Design a protein around this ligand. Structure first.
Ligand SMILES: O=C(Nc1ccnn1-c1ccccn1)c1nc(C2CC2)ccc1Nc1cncnc1
Ligand SMILES: [Cl-]
Ligand SMILES: [Mg+2]
Ligand SMILES: [Zn+2]
Length: 313
């Protein structure tokens, strides 16, 4: 084990920045993930042949959708790598192992439709899982892939460690259900402003990981303006396809899903940054101060959407 993963000089420097873009070459994203696992966790965390097989099976179970795709999985994992590297003392061995995997797997088999669409559509998954429908499916896909021959990347753990890391992965994946994030964030806010927040308490760790998962999931709003602006076209391409499908069920979609309301997108982004993204990163900065650059870049993007609304660009 004296073959080590390296990146070209510009990726080696810029991968440490919260606002790194992983680029348009798909065939380099497996290498970037392994590199992040090797520096984040260690070169000994995983057997390379099992990890490589796991990564390729995960890639094959993401779909060709505009936003919730393979590129989003790796991007979310990289934001988690940055949080882990800038808070290295706060996490256990199992948390480092589970969290990069949770992030790579968190939207497995996404079709670009919300839990709401699956309910209104009466999709079979909505019968199997009444709440966090898609997020329960993604976890179930993660478990199927882990049960494929040659894919048990946790084979060096004891039974009880394996079980714990799969419980970290399950809870991290359920927490990417944005309907759960409002509650979780309000609870961490109270806990922080009263001084009861305690990282030796497992239920509090769970809440902090939950919040890290939302931060990583939304991290597209924390890139430099030209990345953030281009990735918004991709999320809206999904939203408008879901609103089309709502219209096909005879249901008026919510405004952000109506492609006839395309001109109100800038006002939509403000609403989202003020109600969801800014509070999300403010709280995360309060709990993990070295994540400040996520909040900063999010503020800068909010500032850019305000410039668009006043016709300055
Ligand atoms: O824009 C987003 N949502 C949204 C638009 C209007 N209202 N609104 C909203 C309000 C309340 C609740 C939920 N969504 C958005 N949503 C999400 C996850 C699906 C929720 C992830 C990223 C997103 N944006 C984005 C922007 N720039 C670059 N990449 C991504
Ligand atoms: Cl879609
Ligand atoms: Mg999701
Ligand atoms: Zn996601």
């Amino acid at each position: 084990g004296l073959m080590q993963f390296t990146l070209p000089v510009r990726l080696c420097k810029e991968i440490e920045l919260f606002h790194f873009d992983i680029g348009p070459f798909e065939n380099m994203w497996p290498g970037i993930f392994v590199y992040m696992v090797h520096r984040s966790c260690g070169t000994s965390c995983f057997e390379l042949e099992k990890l490589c097989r796991f990564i390729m099976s995960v890639k094959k179970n993401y779909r060709r959708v505009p936003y919730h795709n393979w590129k989003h999985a790796v991007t979310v994992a990289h934001c988690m790598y940055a949080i882990l590297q800038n808070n290295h003392t706060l996490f256990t061995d199992l948390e480092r192992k589970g969290l990069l995997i949770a992030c790579l797997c968190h939207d497995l088999d996404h079709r670009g439709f919300s839990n709401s669409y699956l309910q209104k559509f009466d999709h079979p998954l909505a019968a199997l899982y009444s709440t966090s429908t898609m997020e329960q499916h993604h976890f179930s896909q993660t478990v199927s892939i882990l049960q494929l021959e040659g894919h048990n990347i946790f084979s060096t753990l004891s039974s009880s460690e394996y079980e714990q890391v799969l419980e970290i992965i399950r809870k991290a994946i359920i927490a990417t259900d944005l309907a759960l994030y409002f509650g979780n964030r309000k609870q961490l806010e109270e806990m922080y402003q009263t001084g009861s927040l305690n990282l030796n308490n497992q239920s509090h760790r769970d809440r902090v990981i939950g919040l890290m998962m939302t931060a990583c999931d939304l991290c597209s709003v924390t890139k430099l303006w030209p990345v953030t602006k281009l990735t918004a076209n991709d999320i809206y391409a999904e939203f408008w396809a879901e609103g089309d499908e709502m219209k096909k069920l005879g249901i008026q979609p919510i405004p952000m899903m109506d492609r006839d309301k395309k001109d109100e997108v800038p006002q939509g982004q403000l609403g989202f940054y003020n109600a969801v993204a800014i509070p999300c990163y403010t709280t995360l900065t309060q709990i993990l101060p070295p994540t400040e650059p996520l909040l900063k870049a999010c503020r800068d993007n909010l500032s850019q959407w305000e410039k668009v609304i006043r016709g300055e660009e």
